[PDB]
Amino acid sequence: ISGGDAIYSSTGRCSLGFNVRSGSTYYFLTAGHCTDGATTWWANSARTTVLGTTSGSSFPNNDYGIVRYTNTTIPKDGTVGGQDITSAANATVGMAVTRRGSTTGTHSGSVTALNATVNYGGGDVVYGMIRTNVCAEPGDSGGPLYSGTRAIGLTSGGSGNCSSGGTTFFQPVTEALVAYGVSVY
Amino acid sequence: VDCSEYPKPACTIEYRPLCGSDNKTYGNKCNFCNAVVESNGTLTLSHFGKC
The missing domain is CATH 2.40.10.10 (Trypsin-like serine proteases)
Structure with missing residues (x-):
């Protein structure tokens, strides 16, 4: 797995x-x-x-x-699908990243902001999040965000969808x- | 499911499906409730689980 x-x-x-x-x-x-x-x-x-x-x-x-x-x-x-992973790194604005989830599969995009604050409501606030233009949908939570053979983040949440596009936040x-x-x- | 705290600008994305009155399976309650808002309250819950 x-x-x-x-x-x-x-x-x-x-x-x-x-x-x-x-x-x-x-x-x-x-x-x-x-x-x-x-x-x-x-x-x-x-x-x-x-x-x-x-x-x-x-x-x-x-x-x-x-x-x-x-x-x-x-x-x-020690991979993502068949994509070997050999190290981890810090996201950077403009970085080209790829996400893979159990619902939508693999989708790519870029890091558009760092240290973001996402308020999921009812006191569920997360800090220091990586903002991106990668889409993601229910079931994708926790999937990897990588860049080549480097591990970057874990899927947390966001808005929109893969059809009309959206924003996804990741935990470093x-x-x-x-x-x-x-x-x- | 109560959608009073909606809309919410973001949703975590774990999978726990709900069946809406538009026959669409919504992936989780945060998604379902945001749609209800976007429908201006015309969308309703038909049942729990996938449509």
Whole structure:
């Protein structure tokens, strides 16, 4: 399984951000709003294939979460679809990025602003977000935002859609990797 | 589902579908409620889950 692939909790469906690790322990990152209140994660809607359990969740304010792999046989590819990932980096205005989600698939665009504040309402405010012109739709939450072989962010939320176009905000992945002492591979 | 706090300029995008009266499956409640606003209140919930 890899970045952009669908993941199911007991509440709904999100997408896997990136596969990461610490020593010999494997995790996967995704959106915080997806890990918030979820315990177990499955690879299918049938819930017959287990992935792991939530080990960390930060939302609102930030928007990342980490899940510890409990499944010992499932492939844990260090890619996004077939796109190898070898490092992480900081977004920059004008940077050309690509997103992959379980609903819309892969879509590209550019970073249009940094350190954005997104108010999802009811006190759910996130800060330090990457603004882009990439579209995204329900189910895409937590999917990776990359640039070539570099990991950049995790899909959080936005407006519009892929048909008429839209704006999507992403959580810098560097901050999540640092909080958890994990790294891409 | 109550859409009083709408509209909202942004929505997180997890998938938890609702079926609207326009037979369209909305991906989550924030999406559904923003559409209700945009329809000027003519759009209604038909049932929970996909259409």
